[PDB]
């Protein structure tokens, strides 16, 4: 007997970092980008060596089940770097309960994914987890709620993994340390997110693309982008992408690019891997 | 013309600090404990000198309304120290919109109170604001949600203000810096909150009181209580309180004590002010 669990991932269109301060964020489920965790028997009991979201999901699950001596090991595993912190949490929790064949209502799961994220010190706005449990793009505000969005632009979004494992915590630190000097950054993002909705409302991928490139500049100035991400966006843009920006926690992670044609989309991903992206993925919009 | 806004407050029964890591928290509306803010005309435009939740509520309101030159001043004002960070935010926002006679749906308000709290760097779990907008006690978990609780113990809760202005941010820092050593603290609180629900379910004020005293010890050990708070609880207990603990952000703030008789309640508050509490208040349960 082996326990297995699997979660889908997501990608942030816009609102990264700003969501942390109560500003809206729009994100898209990545239903075909999944993560899997297996749980197996072990000689010695399971221990806690780190504050990473996986170990933390195990712990939070064990605490719940009330098991201190869990003689088990929980490894991971696709599309590697495209699985988020929450995605990993969800998968583990499921794998753990499944191993123990424990009952798991959706409320509980959601409660435990967010708790693991929190004790992993990821400082969740609640957006990652939320989107990984949704099957529709959503509009989100921390500590308040979300609404599902209609998303039909007949466009494609190309996702590229920078290869650099995102230092999300450090990124939140940067924006946090800026204090009041982040307000203009936050403000600018708040606006861009508003227009982003309009554009989406009007099914104007071009308008949208523009807004995204902008979002990237502000994310870059505030200091949470990366050279890998920046050069990938540049490549994106220098190949006719309606727009491009980094998505997620920053300081590593992924890039997203907007396009309205399939030939173009496949071309862009190729071009990107060619430039050094470890993986790519094309999502319909 | 003068703008005015008014919010009610709340008190945390249990889950302080632990709620920050995704653990449940139970809190009670304080409908008769209100805060008021007035907004008036001014010579020079309004500026931002600090990251305190009031100024932050003004800013977030102005940003929303899209007013940069707000030639206005927004002062505060009762039951002083019993008004929370969110309570102050709510009152200001209302006073500001009211001054401008701007439309304000409840969604917007709630969105702006939480945003102000966030830019004021208060690190809201969402509980303060939530309870200040509720008229029923609630069970709460960060980034997930809340449920209203039935609360009928025919008991009284005595609230005492330590006088020391709570250093809530610093307190969150302490628990944050403990890292993994806070897990046992969090765990213990998670449990206590569970029993707290049971007791409430069974209308067992004694059982409940016990749990509260315990909650105070763990809050004290982890290092977020205060001498003023501790000595007040001690006085509470040394006078037959079913239980007592600090409530709120810690490092200052208030104490709550449980009792089931009115004579006892009034007696306790007196005794407490006598010991140095700046204000007291008795809420029905
Ligand atoms: C900074 C944030 O606003 C965005 C984080 O984006 P992701 O959750 O996609 O990042 P990782 O899971 O670390 O790869 C934090 C937050 O809102 O949770
Ligand atoms: C530490 C916390 O869990 C409890 C804060 O309690 P209050 O919001 O009542 O404190 P103040 O408004 O500063 O007086 C933080 C949180 O959950 O928001
Ligand atoms: Mg994340
Ligand atoms: Mg507060």
């Amino acid at each position: 007997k082996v326990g297995v669990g699997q979660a889908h991932s997501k990608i942030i269109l816009i609102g990264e970092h700003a969501v942390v301060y109560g500003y809206p964020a729009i994100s898209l489920p990545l239903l075909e980008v999944e993560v899997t965790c297996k749980v197996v028997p072990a000689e010695s009991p399971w221990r806690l060596y780190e504050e990473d979201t996986l170990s933390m999901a195990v712990y939070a699950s064990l605490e719940y089940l009330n098991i201190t001596e869990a003689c088990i090991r929980c490894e991971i595993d696709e599309k590697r770097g495209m699985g988020s912190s929450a995605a990993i949490s969800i998968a583990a929790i499921r794998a753990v309960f499944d191993y123990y064949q424990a009952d798991l209502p959706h409320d509980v799961l959601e409660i435990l994914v967010n708790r693991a994220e929190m004790i992993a010190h990821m400082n969740p706005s609640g957006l990652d987890a939320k989107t990984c449990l949704s099957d529709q793009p959503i509009r989100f505000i921390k500590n308040v709620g979300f609404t599902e969005l209609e998303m039909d632009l007949s466009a494609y979004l190309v996702i590229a993994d920078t290869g650099v494992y995102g230092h999300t915590r450090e990124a939140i630190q940067v924006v946090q340390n800026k204090g009041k000097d982040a307000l203009p950054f936050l403000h600018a993002l708040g606006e861009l997110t508003q227009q982003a909705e309009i554009a989406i409302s009007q099914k104007d991928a071009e308008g949208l693309g523009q807004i995204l490139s902008q979002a990237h500049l502000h994310l870059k100035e505030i200091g949470v982008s990366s050279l890998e991400a920046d050069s990938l966006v540049e490549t994106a843009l220098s190949h006719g992408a309606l727009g491009a920006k980094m998505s997620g926690g920053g300081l590593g992670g992924c890039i997203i690019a907007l396009v309205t044609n399939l030939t173009h989309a496949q071309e862009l991903a190729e071009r990107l891997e060619e430039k050094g992206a470890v993986q790519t993925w094309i999502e319909s919009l």
Side-chain angles (χ1 to χ4, degrees), chain A residues 2-72 74-76 81-152 154-285:
Chain A
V2 167
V4 170
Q6 176 180 282
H8 69 65
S9 189
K10 107 294 165 169
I11 194 76
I12 302 172
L13 199 66
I14 192 187
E16 296 88 358
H17 287 278
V19 65
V20 166
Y21 295 85
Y23 286 84
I26 295 167
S27 57
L28 310 145
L30 290 197
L31 306 191
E32 303 81 30
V33 169
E34 310 165 84
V35 178
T36 316
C37 284
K38 284 185 193 67
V39 168
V40 297
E43 321 238 343
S44 50
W46 181 88
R47 289 298 180 231
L48 187 22
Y49 299 156
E50 274 160 324
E51 299 203 72
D52 64 284
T53 71
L54 181 68
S55 322
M56 284 318 121
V58 159
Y59 176 77
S61 285
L62 293 178
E63 165 177 60
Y64 187 86
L65 298 174
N66 205 346
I67 290 173
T68 327
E69 299 314 317
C71 276
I72 59 166
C74 186
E75 305 157 276
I76 183 159
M82 296 202 189
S84 83
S85 54
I88 289 160
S89 287
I90 302 172
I93 293 159
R94 285 177 173 159
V96 176
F97 281 62
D98 182 82
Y99 173 76
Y100 286 103
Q101 301 193 292
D103 280 347
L104 185 60
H106 204 273
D107 347 71
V108 179
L109 175 72
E110 179 168 30
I111 296 182
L112 299 175
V113 33
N114 274 107
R115 177 174 297 160
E117 291 249 81
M118 273 161 255
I119 62 183
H121 285 267
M122 295 302 298
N123 266 285
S125 56
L127 176 79
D128 189 1
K130 198 82 265 297
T131 324
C132 289
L133 300 172
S134 183
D135 20 44
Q136 305 282 334
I138 56 160
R139 169 188 158 79
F140 183 99
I141 293 185
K142 192 183 160 183
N143 298 350
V144 183
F146 68 103
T147 290
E148 320 208 324
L149 282 196
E150 182 196 301
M151 182 84 55
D152 189 46
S154 310
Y156 299 81
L157 194 72
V158 180
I159 301 176
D161 179 356
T162 228
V164 173
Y165 202 66
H167 296 77
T168 300
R169 304 195 186 79
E170 331 205 319
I172 291 170
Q173 263 305 148
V174 171
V175 183
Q176 194 195 191
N177 295 336
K178 292 279 169 165
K180 301 195 220 223
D181 286 36
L183 283 195
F185 162 75
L186 295 171
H187 181 64
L189 269 175
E191 300 247 310
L192 292 170
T193 315
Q194 292 180 58
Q195 333 208 85
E197 308 232 23
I198 283 117
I200 291 178
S201 190
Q202 283 170 337
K203 316 183 190 128
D204 169 36
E206 337 229 300
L208 182 62
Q210 266 158 198
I211 311 184
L212 301 183
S213 300
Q214 286 266 40
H216 182 75
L217 293 175
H218 292 99
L219 281 166
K220 193 192 169 165
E221 310 191 78
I222 194 59
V224 292
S225 188
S226 66
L227 288 178
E228 287 81 353
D230 298 331
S231 51
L232 279 181
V233 165
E234 248 150 52
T235 295
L237 289 169
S238 61
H239 273 97
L242 286 174
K245 61 189 269 297
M246 56 149 272
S247 163
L251 306 183
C254 316
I255 286 299
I256 51 162
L258 187 50
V259 175
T260 52
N261 169 268
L262 179 55
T263 303
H264 197 182
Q266 291 183 310
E267 204 238 327
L268 220 49
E270 288 154 10
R271 241 43 137 139
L272 289 165
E273 287 180 36
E274 195 192 18
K275 210 87 175 79
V278 172
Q279 268 204 60
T280 46
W281 170 269
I282 299 167
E283 186 78 16
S284 275
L285 289 172

